[PDB]
């Protein structure tokens, strides 16, 4: 009975440019314990993506300032540690929610591939800053989560589909940035591009319009990786 109220509050917080409140409402609406639809699932994805992206951009700028040179160095180290703490908190929050309430109850291959992709994504965000054994563990979790979603996508999910294309894009960028193995990233992006072009003709107008954006990002990343 409260689900519509929480989703309305989430939409209002999105419109008001305050992503934290919409993220909290999203958290409650999933913690209630019923199956989620595409609209609320995308609202969760965009809310958590926005907050984590703001934290990540702040961390990137902090690290860039820290790189240059005396107490500034340890001050920037402490600031980076604080931003790391916030990033780890939000990432572990979303992963814990995903393991406990979402993927287990997911019923449609489409839902399963989306939640597995989100899990692999946030493990990638953790790996982007994590070092050492924790980095190794989160890398393993990211690869496993991405691979399972890849399997279900190849098994059932439509090959022109925007979620399949986005999974290919994220898997490739993970391969390139984290695993430091650009060959696999280039191969995966090339095969995804080729399959999408193979089934490009039968696309509708709207499906063409959303798919082409991920296609263009795949092309740009392929060009960046291929170039010197």
């Amino acid at each position: 009975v409260d689900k519509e109220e929480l989703v309305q509050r989430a939409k209002l917080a999105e419109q008001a440019e305050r992503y934290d409140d919409m993220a909290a409402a999203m958290k409650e609406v999933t913690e209630t314990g019923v199956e989620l639809s595409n609209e609320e699932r995308n609202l969760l994805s965009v809310a958590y993506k926005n907050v984590v992206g703001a934290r990540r951009s702040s961390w990137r700028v902090i690290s860039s300032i820290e790189q240059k040179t005396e107490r500034k160095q340890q001050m920037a180290k402490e600031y980076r540690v604080k931003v790391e703490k916030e990033l780890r908190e939000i990432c572990y929050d979303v992963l814990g929610l995903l393991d406990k309430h979402l993927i287990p109850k997911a019923s449609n291959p489409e839902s399963k591939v989306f939640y597995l992709k989100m899990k692999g994504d946030y493990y990638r965000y953790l790996a982007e800053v994590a070092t050492g054994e924790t980095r190794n563990s989160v890398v393993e979790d990211s690869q496993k989560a991405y691979q399972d979603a890849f399997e279900i996508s190849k098994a059932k999910m439509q090959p022109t589909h925007p979620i399949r294309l986005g999974l290919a894009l994220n898997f490739s960028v993970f391969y390139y940035e984290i695993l430091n193995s650009p060959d696999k990233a280039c191969q995966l992006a090339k095969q995804a591009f080729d399959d999408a072009i193979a089934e490009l003709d039968t696309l509708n107008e709207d499906s063409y319009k959303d798919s082409t954006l991920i296609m263009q990002l795949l092309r740009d990343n392929l060009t960046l990786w291929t170039s010197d």
Partner: peptide, 16 residues
Amino acid sequence: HSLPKINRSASEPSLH
């Protein structure tokens, strides 16, 4: 034609 037009690899954009 052969040039790349971004400096950093870009993932999936924000949905909706």
